[PDB]
């Protein structure tokens, strides 16, 4: 009875957050994703 009385209609939201926000990310450590993974294709075992 608690389930049939107090179940409510959902309000759906479809949000598309691509990873073009690493350029936007935190404004102190920002980077371009495709350029940096091109940098990570060689010179293994590093980190930015």
């Amino acid at each position: 009875n608690v389930w049939l009385m107090e179940e409510q209609r959902a309000l759906e939201v479809e949000r598309t957050v691509s990873l073009a926000q690493h350029y936007q990310q935190l404004s102190d450590h920002k980077f371009n994703l495709a350029e940096i993974v091109t940098g990570y294709m060689a010179q293994d075992k590093d980190q930015k």
Partner: protein, 48 residues
């Protein structure tokens, strides 16, 4: 001499279980809403 004899010993009387009296009719509440349609509500209410 004269003789004495008791006349008509009284039989006891009938009782009954008069613990049933007036009924106080209880009222009914009001269900607000449900977002489910009628067949699922019948399929649950019949089992209840």
């Amino acid at each position: 001499p004269l003789f004495a004899t008791p006349v008509d010993p009284k039989a006891l009387q009938r009782q009954h279980g008069a613990g049933n009296g007036i009924n106080s009719g209880e009222q009914m509440a009001t269900a607000q809403t449900s977002l489910y349609r009628f067949p699922l509500l019948i399929e649950r209410a019949k089992s209840a």
